[PDB]
Amino acid sequence: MAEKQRQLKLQKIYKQKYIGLGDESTTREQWQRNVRNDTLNTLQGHSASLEYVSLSRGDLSIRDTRIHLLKSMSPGYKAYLREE
């Protein structure tokens, strides 16, 4: 009882630091997003993996791929491209 209710306390502290930590009842919608935002973070982060994506896209400047990756972290970037 005393232990189990410590466990809650660290769960809410870790989730604040590290953002996505699924608990027990996590919507598939909810989990998937965390999987999308870590890939976008890693793809942009390593300098190799930003090149490899930039060249493959044929995007004009490495920098614009890096923003293409960050705006994708928003859910309304799909809509925003469609209205261009």
Partner: protein, 60 residues
């Protein structure tokens, strides 16, 4: 994390609320130690989720 996570993906959802509850503890401990180290290993495919990420299939 990859060879270890193979054991943990299955019951990470699962119907059981209990089996589910126990796997999530382990996954939570892993995600803390590895956030960017899990990214290659997630069991996610273009159909399995709506959006996926189209830049993971790109080959130069």
């Amino acid at each position: 994390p990859g060879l270890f996570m193979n054991y943990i993906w299955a019951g990470l959802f699962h119907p059981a609320k209990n089996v589910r509850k126990a796997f999530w503890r382990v996954y939570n401990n892993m995600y803390v130690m590895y956030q960017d180290a899990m990214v290659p290993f997630y069991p996610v495919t273009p159909d399995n989720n709506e959006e996926y990420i189209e830049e993971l299939d790109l080959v130069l």
